[PDB]
Structure 1
Amino acid sequence: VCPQGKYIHPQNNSICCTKCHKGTYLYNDCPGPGQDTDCRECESGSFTASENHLRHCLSCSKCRKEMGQVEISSCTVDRDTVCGCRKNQYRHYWSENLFQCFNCSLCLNGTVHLSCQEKQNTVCTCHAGFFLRENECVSCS
Protein backbone atom coordinates (compact mmCIF):
# COMPACT_ATOMS: atom_id res chain seq x y z
CA VAL A 1 0.00 0.00 0.00
CA CYS A 2 2.03 2.92 -1.32
CA PRO A 3 1.18 6.46 -0.10
CA GLN A 4 -1.14 8.87 -1.91
CA GLY A 5 -0.17 10.23 -5.31
CA LYS A 6 1.57 7.03 -6.42
CA TYR A 7 0.44 4.07 -8.52
CA ILE A 8 1.78 0.52 -8.59
CA HIS A 9 3.85 -0.49 -11.60
CA PRO A 10 1.90 -2.93 -13.83
CA GLN A 11 4.95 -5.22 -14.05
CA ASN A 12 7.20 -6.16 -11.12
CA ASN A 13 4.59 -5.20 -8.54
CA SER A 14 6.97 -4.06 -5.81
CA ILE A 15 7.84 -0.51 -7.00
CA CYS A 16 5.35 2.36 -7.19
CA CYS A 17 5.80 5.68 -8.96
CA THR A 18 4.12 9.08 -8.90
CA LYS A 19 1.05 9.65 -11.06
CA CYS A 20 1.17 12.15 -13.90
CA HIS A 21 -0.41 15.51 -13.13
CA LYS A 22 -3.18 17.31 -15.00
CA GLY A 23 -2.53 18.05 -18.66
CA THR A 24 -0.20 15.05 -19.04
CA TYR A 25 -0.62 11.39 -19.98
CA LEU A 26 1.61 8.39 -19.40
CA TYR A 27 3.86 7.54 -22.35
CA ASN A 28 6.28 5.15 -20.64
CA ASP A 29 6.48 3.52 -17.22
CA CYS A 30 9.07 4.19 -14.53
CA PRO A 31 12.64 3.26 -15.63
CA GLY A 32 13.50 2.07 -12.13
CA PRO A 33 12.67 3.03 -8.54
CA GLY A 34 12.93 6.72 -7.71
CA GLN A 35 13.02 8.02 -11.29
CA ASP A 36 10.40 10.33 -12.77
CA THR A 37 7.54 9.02 -14.88
CA ASP A 38 7.29 9.71 -18.61
CA CYS A 39 4.41 12.20 -18.73
CA ARG A 40 3.72 13.90 -22.07
CA GLU A 41 1.49 16.91 -22.70
CA CYS A 42 -1.88 16.21 -24.31
CA GLU A 43 -2.25 17.13 -27.98
CA SER A 44 -4.95 19.36 -29.46
CA GLY A 45 -8.49 18.21 -28.72
CA SER A 46 -7.38 16.08 -25.76
CA PHE A 47 -7.24 16.79 -22.03
CA THR A 48 -6.78 15.28 -18.58
CA ALA A 49 -8.65 16.98 -15.74
CA SER A 50 -7.10 15.10 -12.79
CA GLU A 51 -4.04 13.17 -11.67
CA ASN A 52 -3.81 10.01 -13.75
CA HIS A 53 -1.59 7.35 -15.28
CA LEU A 54 -3.83 6.80 -18.31
CA ARG A 55 -2.25 5.82 -21.62
CA HIS A 56 -4.10 8.60 -23.47
CA CYS A 57 -5.92 11.85 -22.76
CA LEU A 58 -9.70 12.23 -22.69
CA SER A 59 -11.38 13.82 -25.70
CA CYS A 60 -12.69 17.25 -24.70
CA SER A 61 -16.40 17.87 -25.21
CA LYS A 62 -18.06 20.16 -27.75
CA CYS A 63 -20.88 22.60 -27.09
CA ARG A 64 -24.22 21.53 -28.55
CA LYS A 65 -25.50 24.04 -31.11
CA GLU A 66 -29.07 22.67 -31.06
CA MET A 67 -29.29 23.30 -27.29
CA GLY A 68 -28.30 26.96 -27.61
CA GLN A 69 -25.04 26.34 -25.75
CA VAL A 70 -22.05 28.66 -26.11
CA GLU A 71 -18.35 28.00 -25.51
CA ILE A 72 -17.42 29.85 -22.32
CA SER A 73 -13.97 28.23 -22.12
CA SER A 74 -11.90 26.56 -24.83
CA CYS A 75 -10.56 23.00 -24.85
CA THR A 76 -7.28 23.26 -22.94
CA VAL A 77 -4.84 20.50 -21.97
CA ASP A 78 -5.90 20.28 -18.30
CA ARG A 79 -9.49 21.61 -18.28
CA ASP A 80 -12.56 20.33 -20.12
CA THR A 81 -14.52 22.55 -22.49
CA VAL A 82 -17.04 24.70 -20.61
CA CYS A 83 -20.43 25.17 -22.27
CA GLY A 84 -23.11 27.53 -21.00
CA CYS A 85 -25.81 29.97 -22.05
CA ARG A 86 -25.76 33.60 -23.17
CA LYS A 87 -27.20 36.61 -21.35
CA ASN A 88 -30.73 36.33 -19.92
CA GLN A 89 -30.81 32.55 -20.36
CA TYR A 90 -30.84 29.60 -17.96
CA ARG A 91 -29.88 25.95 -18.38
CA HIS A 92 -32.40 23.15 -17.82
CA TYR A 93 -30.74 19.80 -17.09
CA TRP A 94 -32.30 16.83 -18.86
CA SER A 95 -29.59 14.58 -17.38
CA GLU A 96 -26.36 14.94 -15.41
CA ASN A 97 -24.28 16.10 -18.40
CA LEU A 98 -27.02 17.29 -20.80
CA PHE A 99 -28.68 20.70 -20.56
CA GLN A 100 -30.67 23.02 -22.82
CA CYS A 101 -30.58 26.82 -22.76
CA PHE A 102 -33.95 28.56 -22.41
CA ASN A 103 -34.72 32.27 -22.33
CA CYS A 104 -35.55 33.58 -18.87
CA SER A 105 -39.29 33.95 -18.32
CA LEU A 106 -40.18 37.63 -18.09
CA CYS A 107 -42.87 38.50 -15.56
CA LEU A 108 -46.23 39.54 -17.03
CA ASN A 109 -48.83 40.90 -14.58
CA GLY A 110 -46.60 39.69 -11.75
CA THR A 111 -43.47 40.33 -9.73
CA VAL A 112 -40.06 38.65 -9.62
CA HIS A 113 -39.76 36.70 -6.38
CA LEU A 114 -36.34 35.33 -7.40
CA SER A 115 -34.10 36.44 -10.25
CA CYS A 116 -33.06 34.17 -13.12
CA GLN A 117 -30.25 32.01 -11.73
CA GLU A 118 -27.79 29.91 -13.73
CA LYS A 119 -29.69 26.61 -13.33
CA GLN A 120 -33.12 27.97 -12.39
CA ASN A 121 -35.85 29.84 -14.23
CA THR A 122 -37.24 33.17 -13.06
CA VAL A 123 -39.68 32.73 -10.17
CA CYS A 124 -42.73 34.90 -10.83
CA THR A 125 -45.50 35.54 -8.29
CA CYS A 126 -48.80 36.78 -9.71
CA HIS A 127 -51.36 39.18 -8.24
CA ALA A 128 -55.13 39.15 -7.74
CA GLY A 129 -56.95 37.95 -10.84
CA PHE A 130 -53.95 35.95 -12.12
CA PHE A 131 -52.40 32.60 -11.24
CA LEU A 132 -49.21 30.75 -12.12
CA ARG A 133 -49.08 28.13 -14.87
CA GLU A 134 -45.87 26.89 -16.53
CA ASN A 135 -44.09 29.83 -14.84
CA GLU A 136 -46.47 32.27 -16.55
CA CYS A 137 -49.18 34.41 -14.97
CA VAL A 138 -52.53 33.84 -16.67
CA SER A 139 -56.02 35.09 -15.88
CA CYS A 140 -58.28 32.79 -13.86
CA SER A 141 -61.27 33.50 -16.13
Structure 2
Amino acid sequence: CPQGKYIHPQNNSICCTKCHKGTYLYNDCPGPGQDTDCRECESGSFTASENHLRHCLSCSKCRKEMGQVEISSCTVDRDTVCGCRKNQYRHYWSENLFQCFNCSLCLNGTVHLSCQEKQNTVCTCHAGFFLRENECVSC
Protein backbone atom coordinates (compact mmCIF):
# COMPACT_ATOMS: atom_id res chain seq x y z
CA CYS A 1 0.00 0.00 0.00
CA PRO A 2 1.22 3.68 0.34
CA GLN A 3 4.98 3.96 0.89
CA GLY A 4 5.03 5.87 4.20
CA LYS A 5 2.40 3.58 5.72
CA TYR A 6 2.51 -0.16 6.59
CA ILE A 7 -0.08 -2.94 6.93
CA HIS A 8 -1.77 -3.47 10.33
CA PRO A 9 -0.86 -6.89 11.78
CA GLN A 10 -4.40 -8.08 12.73
CA ASN A 11 -6.30 -6.54 9.86
CA ASN A 12 -5.13 -6.31 6.31
CA SER A 13 -6.23 -3.04 4.55
CA ILE A 14 -5.76 -0.68 7.51
CA CYS A 15 -2.50 0.92 6.35
CA CYS A 16 -1.18 2.92 9.35
CA THR A 17 1.21 5.83 9.16
CA LYS A 18 4.83 4.71 9.81
CA CYS A 19 6.80 6.39 12.61
CA HIS A 20 9.47 8.78 11.44
CA LYS A 21 13.04 9.12 12.75
CA GLY A 22 13.59 9.61 16.50
CA THR A 23 10.53 7.57 17.45
CA TYR A 24 9.27 3.99 17.70
CA LEU A 25 6.03 2.16 17.23
CA TYR A 26 4.54 2.01 20.70
CA ASN A 27 1.10 0.93 19.37
CA ASP A 28 -0.33 0.30 15.93
CA CYS A 29 -2.79 3.01 14.87
CA PRO A 30 -6.40 2.15 16.01
CA GLY A 31 -8.37 2.57 12.77
CA PRO A 32 -7.97 4.15 9.26
CA GLY A 33 -7.40 7.89 9.60
CA GLN A 34 -6.15 7.54 13.18
CA ASP A 35 -2.68 8.45 14.37
CA THR A 36 -0.17 5.70 14.99
CA ASP A 37 1.19 5.87 18.55
CA CYS A 38 4.94 6.57 18.18
CA ARG A 39 7.18 7.54 21.07
CA GLU A 40 10.48 9.32 21.47
CA CYS A 41 13.50 7.08 21.96
CA GLU A 42 14.99 7.40 25.47
CA SER A 43 18.53 8.86 25.57
CA GLY A 44 20.91 6.20 24.34
CA SER A 45 18.40 4.96 21.78
CA PHE A 46 17.90 6.14 18.23
CA THR A 47 16.10 5.30 14.98
CA ALA A 48 17.30 6.97 11.86
CA SER A 49 14.32 6.25 9.63
CA GLU A 50 10.73 5.34 8.74
CA ASN A 51 10.02 2.43 10.98
CA HIS A 52 7.55 0.39 12.87
CA LEU A 53 10.10 -0.93 15.33
CA ARG A 54 8.92 -1.93 18.80
CA HIS A 55 12.15 -0.70 20.40
CA CYS A 56 14.81 1.83 19.57
CA LEU A 57 18.36 0.79 18.66
CA SER A 58 21.24 1.26 21.11
CA CYS A 59 23.75 3.98 20.36
CA SER A 60 27.18 2.64 19.33
CA LYS A 61 30.30 2.91 21.53
CA CYS A 62 33.48 3.49 19.45
CA ARG A 63 36.16 0.78 19.41
CA LYS A 64 38.75 2.04 21.92
CA GLU A 65 41.16 -0.82 21.18
CA MET A 66 41.15 0.49 17.57
CA GLY A 67 42.10 3.94 18.86
CA GLN A 68 38.78 5.37 17.64
CA VAL A 69 37.37 8.59 19.19
CA GLU A 70 33.79 9.77 19.06
CA ILE A 71 33.30 12.62 16.65
CA SER A 72 29.52 13.23 17.07
CA SER A 73 27.40 12.25 19.99
CA CYS A 74 24.39 10.04 19.54
CA THR A 75 20.96 11.66 19.31
CA VAL A 76 17.47 10.20 19.06
CA ASP A 77 17.85 10.07 15.22
CA ARG A 78 21.59 10.05 14.38
CA ASP A 79 23.88 7.34 15.78
CA THR A 80 27.36 8.06 17.29
CA VAL A 81 30.03 8.96 14.70
CA CYS A 82 33.51 7.64 15.29
CA GLY A 83 36.79 8.52 13.77
CA CYS A 84 40.36 9.38 14.50
CA ARG A 85 42.15 12.56 15.60
CA LYS A 86 43.40 14.45 12.50
CA ASN A 87 47.11 13.69 12.03
CA GLN A 88 45.93 10.00 12.01
CA TYR A 89 44.56 7.95 9.10
CA ARG A 90 42.14 5.04 9.00
CA HIS A 91 42.85 1.47 8.01
CA TYR A 92 39.76 -0.58 7.24
CA TRP A 93 39.80 -4.21 8.36
CA SER A 94 36.18 -4.72 7.29
CA GLU A 95 33.54 -2.43 5.74
CA ASN A 96 32.72 -1.35 9.34
CA LEU A 97 35.86 -1.83 11.33
CA PHE A 98 38.73 0.64 10.98
CA GLN A 99 41.77 1.20 13.24
CA CYS A 100 43.38 4.66 13.65
CA PHE A 101 47.11 4.99 12.90
CA ASN A 102 49.46 8.00 13.42
CA CYS A 103 50.59 9.66 10.10
CA SER A 104 54.28 9.38 9.25
CA LEU A 105 56.32 12.53 9.62
CA CYS A 106 58.99 11.65 7.07
CA LEU A 107 61.94 12.10 9.38
CA ASN A 108 65.18 12.02 7.37
CA GLY A 109 63.09 12.67 4.25
CA THR A 110 60.65 14.93 2.40
CA VAL A 111 56.87 14.59 2.28
CA HIS A 112 56.04 13.23 -1.21
CA LEU A 113 52.26 12.90 -0.54
CA SER A 114 50.54 14.35 2.51
CA CYS A 115 48.56 12.09 4.82
CA GLN A 116 44.96 11.32 3.76
CA GLU A 117 41.76 10.08 5.53
CA LYS A 118 42.45 6.49 4.53
CA GLN A 119 46.15 6.67 3.64
CA ASN A 120 49.49 7.22 5.33
CA THR A 121 51.96 9.97 4.29
CA VAL A 122 54.33 8.88 1.46
CA CYS A 123 57.91 10.01 2.05
CA THR A 124 60.93 10.33 -0.25
CA CYS A 125 64.13 9.68 1.58
CA HIS A 126 67.20 11.87 1.60
CA ALA A 127 70.19 10.57 -0.35
CA GLY A 128 71.94 8.03 1.89
CA PHE A 129 68.68 6.58 3.24
CA PHE A 130 66.46 3.56 2.40
CA LEU A 131 62.66 3.85 2.41
CA ARG A 132 61.88 0.70 4.50
CA GLU A 133 58.02 0.61 4.43
CA ASN A 134 57.27 4.24 5.42
CA GLU A 135 60.42 5.19 7.33
CA CYS A 136 63.88 6.20 6.12
CA VAL A 137 66.65 3.96 7.48
CA SER A 138 70.35 4.85 7.01
CA CYS A 139 72.48 2.69 4.66
TM-score calculated relative to the size of structure 1: 0.86
Q: Which stretch of structure 1 is more off in the superposition, 116-125 or 28-37?
A: 116-125
Q: Which stretch of structure 1 is more off in the superposition, 21-30 or 68-77?
A: 68-77
Q: What do the CA deviations read for 1:105-137 (whole angstroms, capped 9, x no partner)?
A: 111343333322222222334465545442334
Q: Which stretch of structure 1 is more off in the superposition, 129-138 or 115-124?
A: 129-138
Aligned residues: 139
* SS of corresponding position for 1:66: helix
CA distance in 2, matches of 1:90, 1:34: 52
* SS of corresponding position for 2:25: strand
CA distance in 2, matches of 1:50, 1:122: 38
In structure 2, the CA distance between the partners of 1:23 and 1:115, relative to structure 1 (3 Å rule), is: same
Q: Which stretch of structure 1 is more off in the superposition, 39-48 or 119-128?
A: 119-128
CA distance in 1, matches of 2:54, 2:124: 54
* SS of corresponding position for 1:3: coil
Q: CA RMSD in A?
A: 1.9
C-alpha displacement of 1:12: 0.7
In structure 2, the CA distance between the partners of 1:24 and 1:138, relative to structure 1 (3 Å rule), is: same
C-alpha displacement of 1:139: 5.1
Q: Which stretch of structure 1 is more off in the superposition, 76-85 or 111-120?
A: 111-120
C-alpha displacement of 1:20: 0.7
CA distance in 2, matches of 1:53, 1:126: 58
In structure 2, the CA distance between the partners of 1:109 and 1:41, relative to structure 1 (3 Å rule), is: same
In structure 2, the CA distance between the partners of 1:107 and 1:14, relative to structure 1 (3 Å rule), is: same
In structure 2, the CA distance between the partners of 1:48 and 1:137, relative to structure 1 (3 Å rule), is: same
Identity of aligned residues (%): 100
Q: What do the CA deviations read for 1:19-45 (whole angstroms, capped 9, x no partner)?
A: 111110000001100112111000121
Q: Which stretch of structure 1 is more off in the superposition, 129-138 or 19-28?
A: 129-138
Q: Is the 8 A contact 2:71 2:83 kept in 1?
A: yes
Q: Is the 8 A contact 2:2 2:15 kept in 1?
A: no
Structure 1 runs not aligned, ≥5 long: none
C-alpha displacement of 1:81: 0.6
Structure 2 runs not aligned, ≥5 long: none
